[PDB]
Design a protein around this ligand. Structure first.
Ligand SMILES: Cc1cc2nc3c(=O)[nH]c(=O)nc-3n(C[C@H](O)[C@H](O)[C@H](O)COP(=O)(O)OP(=O)(O)OC[C@H]3O[C@@H](n4cnc5c(N)ncnc54)[C@H](O)[C@@H]3O)c2cc1C
Length: 456
């Protein structure tokens, strides 16, 4: 990367906001997955959207790849600089604006996390529900198409992103639904917002997100329920969904995951395949939901509910840190994770099969999942130096992905494709799907400089 180019970057954002130091680049060359670190040639911190536009235009016209970087909590290698280039860390733009409580909407910049937003909203009676375990950038969550434990009731990022401000690869500024606009529904033209949700930094740089807010629930009850088998826990889940109980949260942990979370968070749940549950409503509707849900879990051998502000907060903090609980089983390890999502009636087959396949192998694996969406993760601990085991883990993940595709599902419910699932995506949507996706990529990023090597 030439000295003249570095000076041009510094002229846009300021000398302190450009770094070519090896240690700084290495810290921005990896995320939380096992994908090996590939450092960008420079890291740049733009201070406003005009600077984002000017950095993008500079890189684009000089043939330098651009890698958007939020909080670096992704798990598919999205920020790995496989072709070098400039990593654009967006988190100094951290303002909340256009809070419209009467319309249930707010605008956030990339440095705003879910925790920051919900702190800003206390005593408003509103909250933002999409809750990945990590303290991630909300714009990064829009870029990956994230979901969370609350999505079963309150929707994913795709359901809750109303508008996006995007710097396109050559620097033009796009407001996907129109500048300043916010509304419940529209048929006006093609829905551009949905195209950029889940684009993972390959179509442009999200510099603000307009988010749907939700009313805080009148009352909340959380509980855990232990089961004799994975089959019994997942059968209960499917039957709760088929009975249309509007559960707020329904999370599955297998016995390995439950033990790991016990050791990592000082929960003391019985070591068993377990559902973490949460219900929202008035006392009238809560009693009803609890009736019907306990009836179904009882039929499948579930325990009497172990009830859980502080202990509920402990419970979900433990769930949100399950990834790190899994890592603590094998200290010094990184992990890869599957993330399939299947038609819910096929969820029992594939989780029970996954549990059986994990035991039939020497692999360490923990299972946790948004099973209310028909989605789950197998978190696979890897020694960073054991090449044999690492290709056993990638082969396991590949096979599980193809099993989900055989059942009519998808290879990723929320984490994305990044570097790891590109072959699975080709199988998932076929040749005409791949070409159509590539044609959209090419019109927005003709030079292929927008996070190259990812997704397609
Ligand atoms: C403990 C743990 C728990 C998690 N739980 C969940 C979960 O329940 N659900 C879930 O969906 N994910 C989960 N994740 C994954 C991760 O938190 C999400 O994918 C999150 O959306 C990533 O945001 P980020 O800013 O940290 O991404 P980064 O790693 O910074 O970036 C991810 C990708 O998005 C791109 N990108 C980032 N910001 C922008 C932007 N502003 N504009 C354009 N492209 C951008 C990057 O180029 C990259 O390709 C978890 C991760 C961890 C470590």
């Amino acid at each position: 990367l030439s000295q003249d180019f570095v000076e041009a970057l510094k002229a846009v954002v300021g000398s302190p906001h450009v770094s070519t130091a090896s240690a700084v680049r290495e810290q921005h060359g990896h995320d939380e997955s096992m994908h090996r670190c590939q450092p960008p040639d420079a890291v740049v911190w733009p201070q406003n959207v005009d600077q984002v536009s000017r950095v993008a235009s500079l890189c684009y016209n000089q043939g330098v790849p651009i890698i958007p970087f939020g909080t670096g909590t992704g798990v598919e290698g999205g920020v790995c600089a496989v072709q070098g280039g400039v990593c654009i860390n967006l988190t100094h733009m951290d303002q909340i604006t256009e809070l419209n409580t009467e319309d249930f909407s707010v605008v956030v910049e990339p440095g705003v996390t879910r925790k920051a937003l919900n702190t800003h909203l206390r005593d408003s009676g509103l909250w933002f529900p999409v809750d990945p375990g990590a303290d991630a950038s909300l714009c990064g969550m829009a870029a990956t198409g994230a979901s969370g434990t609350n999505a079963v009731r309150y929707g994913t990022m795709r359901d809750n992103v109303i508008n996006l401000e995007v710097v396109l690869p050559d620097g033009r500024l796009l407001h996907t639904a129109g500048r300043g606009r916010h509304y419940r529904k529209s048929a006006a033209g093609y829905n551009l917002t949905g195209l950029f949700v889940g684009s993972e930094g390959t179509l442009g740089i999200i510099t603000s997100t307009t988010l749907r807010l939700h009313p805080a629930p009148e009352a909340t009850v959380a509980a855990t329920c232990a089961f004799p088998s994975v089959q019994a826990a997942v059968d209960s889940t499917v039957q709760i969904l088929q009975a249309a109980v509007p559960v707020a949260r329904i999370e599955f942990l297998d016995d390995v995951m439950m033990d790991a979370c016990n050791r990592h968070s000082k929960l003391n749940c019985p070591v068993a395949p377990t559902l973490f549950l949460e219900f929202h409503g008035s006392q009238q509707t809560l009693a009803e939901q609890l009736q019907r849900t306990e009836a179904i879990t009882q039929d499948n051998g579930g325990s009497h509910f172990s009830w859980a502000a502080e202990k509920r907060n402990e419970l979900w903090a433990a769930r949100h840190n399950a990834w790190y609980a899994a890592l603590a089983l094998s200290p010094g390890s990184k992990a890869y994770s599957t993330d399939v999502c299947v038609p819910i009636s096929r969820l029992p087959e594939i989780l029970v099969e996954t549990k059986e396949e994990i035991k039939a192998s020497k692999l360490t694996g923990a299972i946790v999942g948004h099973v209310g969406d028909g989605n789950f993760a197998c978190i696979l601990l890897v020694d960073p130096d054991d090449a044999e085991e690492q290709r056993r883990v990638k082969a396991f993940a590949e096979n599980l992905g193809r099993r989900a595709l055989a059942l009519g599902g998808t290879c990723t419910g929320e984490h994305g494709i990044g570097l790891g699932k590109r072959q699975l995506l080709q199988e998932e949507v076929g040749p005409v799907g791949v070409e159509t996706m590539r044609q959209l990529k090419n019109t927005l990023d003709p030079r292929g400089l927008m996070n190259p090597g990812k997704v397609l």
